Amino acid sequence: APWRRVVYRRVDLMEESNAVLYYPPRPIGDRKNLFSTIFGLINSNSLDVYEYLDGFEAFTDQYKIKFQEFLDRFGIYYQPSTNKNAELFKVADSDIPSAEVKAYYVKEEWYFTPTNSDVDIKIQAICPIMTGQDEFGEVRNQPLFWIPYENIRPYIARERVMLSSLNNTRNSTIDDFFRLNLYKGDIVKTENLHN
Amino acid sequence: WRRVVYRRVDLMEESNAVLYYPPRPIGDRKNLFSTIFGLINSNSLDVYEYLDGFEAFTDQYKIKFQEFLDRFGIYYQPSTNKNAELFKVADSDIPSAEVKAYYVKEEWYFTPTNSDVDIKIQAICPIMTGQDEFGEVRNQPLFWIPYENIRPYIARERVMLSSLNNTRNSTIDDFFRLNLYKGDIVKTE
Prior knowledge:
Structural class of chain A: alpha+beta
Largest interface: A-B, 25 and 25 residues
Radius of gyration of chain A: 17 Å
Shape of chain A: globular
Assembly: dimeric
Distance between the termini of chain A: 9 Å
PDB class: protein transport
Chains A, B: Por secretion system protein porN/gldN
Entry title: Crystal structure of the folded domain of PorN
Oligomer: homodimer
Keywords: secretion system, Porphyromonas gingivalis, protein transport
Strand content of chain A: 25-35%
Number of domains of chain A: 1
Largest sheet of chain A: 6 strands, antiparallel
Order of helices and strands of chain A: EHHEEEEEEHHE
């Protein structure tokens, strides 16, 4: 009787509708983009992120990202932290690949409501995709990790963003952008859920 | 004296086709990736995480086979004999046909003899080409194999080479040790 599916969408930050998640490419003054926010939150032990696996998502302790391994894997320069409670490592903004994350994978869950006869679309998780040259000169698109939407929601609910579709209200947040499905992207995968 | 050189070895090229031969195990004949995969599954080979910028052959970066299978979407089932294999993996799900290149890490020794450049293989990295869960075709370095770890096994793997006038005594170890592979330098340290 219940009718559910999982939909994965590729959200390109170069498109006007999604540009809000990219500006500024590197932090300027008080403003930073979504990736710079995410990176800062992982470094401050405020956000649990999970390994990108090809074919499924597992938000378990086994697949929880080991931040140092992540930094070493993607060649991000770091130094020891002078206060382990504030940050796991000392990482300068210029070494953070916030300008290189030009797309996100967005996992949604579609739920049929019996009484309403309508379908509810709810964001479940997001995955930043980094574009850049590897150590061997190859340009690669690399999904970095999965962020369960519940983990990031308290922080993006406190991040104000201007949206032309919302007539540039100063009350809209990044959480509103995702919850209200204001992002645009193509469906890259679908999975029917079998209860 | 020493210098680290990385070479991309394309398995499609005639000179390197011997490492790709056959794309999947034809009865008893298996290619280099199939041998590697089989040894990791039988707990006979230690392989290490591919890191962008450096190689660390330490316990911290040792590949965990199940995590590797999950990460690269290789279908597996529980093993019926844990002593022979960690997991039951069908040949069609083993990406032996999708590994069409390797990164080869070389140590160059130079001397004061003259310009003796002696090239010693240090490690190899299979590169898998294929579509991910989201339809994107990607080139993915899988892991680093220290050459010493694989050497005793590929020293027992016979291969026919036209450059060696098809002797039945040449091994895959000879192919690597004698620098019979061909490829472009992609990085120098």
